[PDB]
Every structure is written in C-alpha cells, then in structure tokens.
C-alpha cells in the first residue's frame, strides 16, 4: 500500500524521499565521481531558515495547545530536524574546503534523511492531534446516546440538541476520508458513517415509539448498532 497515510503528508515527503533515492543510486553508480561540487553554503542556509521557521511555528503550537499528548510528542521532532540541519552544514563546509570530498557524501545523505525523518514525525504527531479532535466529537455522540435510556416528549428536545453535533461529526469524517491514502480505510469510514446517519431517523422514531417492553429493546438495539458504528469509526480513524 502507500507509505504516507495522508494525501498532504505524501505530497510533501514523497518527492524528497524519492529524490534521495536518485542520489544513492548515483553515488553507487559513480555518476558524481571526480566532480567538483558547487558551493552549497547558500542552499544550506535556505534550509536552515526554513527549518528555523518550522520549529518556531511548532514551538508556538506546543505552547498554545490544549492537547497533552501533542505537548510531549512534538518537541523531539524539533531536535531531530535541528541536528539533521547541523549535518548538512558540516557537509556544506567539507565541500567548501574540498569540492571533491567523498566523506562529505555521508553527512549530506544522513542530513537529508534526518530532515525528512524529523519533518514526517512533526507532521505525523500533528495529524494524531487532528485525529483526537475527531475522536473527541465521536466519543461525545457516544455518551449522548447513552443518555437515551432516560427519555416523554417532554424530556425530543434532546433530538433537537443533537442535530448540530451529528453534523460536526459527519463533516469531520467526510473531509477526513478525502485525505486518507488507504482506500480500504476510506470505504470503512464512509460506510460506517452512512450507517450512522441512516440509523438516526430510526433512533428518533424508536424513541417516539416509546409512548411495554418491546419498544424498549428495539430502542436499546438501535443505540447499540449506532454505537458499534461510531466505535468502528474511532478505531479506523487510528489505523
């Protein structure tokens, strides 16, 4: 299957990753042998600024965020990114003192991979945060359903106060599946969600039909199935 579970992550990291593949096969082929390498100090400066901005932005998010998992997981990525950046600098220097440096070939590759690796981690960590947001809403609706085995028409205002929530979720999943790169995963999200919204009316109706013992379980069942789907969503959201 694909390597980057997101269409955005992949659009950014796939090229770099491949580009690094070109190089390895080249050095291995000797395509760059006895060749003088143009001054890379400027380009490496570029990357150094770029990485600096990213880290600055990351540092802000880690500060102003409410996600505790996020707070503990982003910082390492910054370190990785920054150290990688140091290998690139040295490499720039070793090729300035010796345009034909062969050893310098290693901190360039190691540096590049470091940046790519570090970035993906930052990106993966943030996505996980994004997922917890979707999971937050979901877990809500699940609780909100638990509050169904305690409802006269006096106490369907309940169905009215649910409408918006059910929409936020439907939006999150819809917009989420448009991003996943694992097609299977997408179908599961889409099917599950479809089932949840199809089963909504049936739930409201099962509750009116509450006006004996049979009407009760036809209700309890409906919340079971809706819960199963919503739980299925949460699971698939984490794969």
């Amino acid at each position: 299957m694909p390597v980057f579970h997101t269409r955005t992550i992949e659009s950014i990291l796939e090229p770099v990753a491949q580009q690094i593949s070109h190089l390895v096969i080249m050095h291995e082929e000797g395509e760059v042998d006895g060749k003088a390498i143009p001054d890379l100090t400027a380009p490496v400066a570029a990357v150094q600024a770029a990485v600096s901005n990213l880290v600055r932005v990351g540092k802000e998010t880690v500060q102003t965020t409410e996600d505790q998992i996020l707070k503990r997981d982003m910082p390492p990525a910054f370190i990785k990114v920054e150290n990688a950046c140091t290998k690139l600098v040295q490499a720039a220097q070793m090729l300035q003192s010796d345009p034909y440096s062969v050893p310098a070939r290693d901190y360039l590759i190691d540096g590049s991979r470091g940046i790519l690796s570090g970035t993906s981690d930052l990106l993966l960590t943030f996505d996980e945060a994004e997922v917890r947001k979707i999971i937050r809403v979901c877990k809500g609706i699940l609780e909100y359903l638990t509050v169904a085995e305690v409802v006269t028409m006096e106490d369907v205002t309940y169905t009215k106060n649910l409408g918006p929530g059910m929409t936020k979720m439907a939006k999150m999943i819809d917009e989420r599946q448009q991003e996943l790169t694992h097609q299977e995963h997408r179908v599961m999200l889409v099917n599950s969600m479809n089932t949840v919204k199809e089963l909504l009316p049936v739930l409201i109706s099962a509750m009116k039909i509450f006006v004996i013992e049979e009407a009760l379980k036809n209700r309890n069942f409906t919340v079971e199935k809706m819960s199963a789907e919503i739980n299925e969503i949460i699971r698939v959201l984490q794969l």
């Binding site: 955005t8 950014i12 990291l13 090229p15 770099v16 580009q19 690094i20 070109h22 190089l23 080249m26 395509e31 760059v32 060749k35 390498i37 143009p38 890379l40 380009p43 490496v44 570029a46 990357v47 600024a49 770029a50 990485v51 901005n53 990213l54 932005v57 990351g58 998010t61 990114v81 690139l88 360039l108 590049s112 940046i115 790519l116 970035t119 930052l122 990106l123 943030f126 994004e130 947001k133 937050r136 809403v137 877990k139 809500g140 609706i141 609780e143 909100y144 509050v147 106490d155 205002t157 309940y158 106060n161 649910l162 918006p164 929530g165 936020k168």
Partner: protein
C-alpha cells in the same frame, strides 16, 4: 435533565464558525522546497531522467 445533554454537548458539539494546520503545512513545504533545491543543486542538472519527467507532467495535464 436538559443540562445533562449540554454538560456533554460542551465537549465540542457545535458549529465551528472561525490557520495552524495550513501554517505548519506551509513551513513543512518551505523545508521541502529548500531541501529539494539543495539536492538538485548538489547533483546538478546531470545524469537523471528529465525528459520523461517533462512528458509525465504534460501527459497528466491532459488529465489531472
């Protein structure tokens, strides 16, 4: 009774009305860019497949 539904509806169950994600992604693109240049410049414009690269880009323009 009706506050229960709100006591949990407070767990982010409303409209959103109305940058960090785009910002992050932006900067990650910045890094991708600088890094990609740095490597296109080290290799130099030599050896690699650049024509099959152009065509592929033109081809999926008759599509994308």
């Amino acid at each position: 009774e009706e506050r229960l539904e709100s006591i949990i509806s407070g767990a982010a169950l409303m409209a959103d009305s109305s940058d960090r994600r785009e910002r992050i992604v932006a900067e990650c693109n910045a890094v991708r860019q600088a890094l990609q240049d740095l490597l296109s410049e080290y290799m130099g414009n030599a050896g690699r497949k650049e024509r099959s690269d152009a065509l592929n880009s033109a081809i999926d323009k008759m599509t994308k």
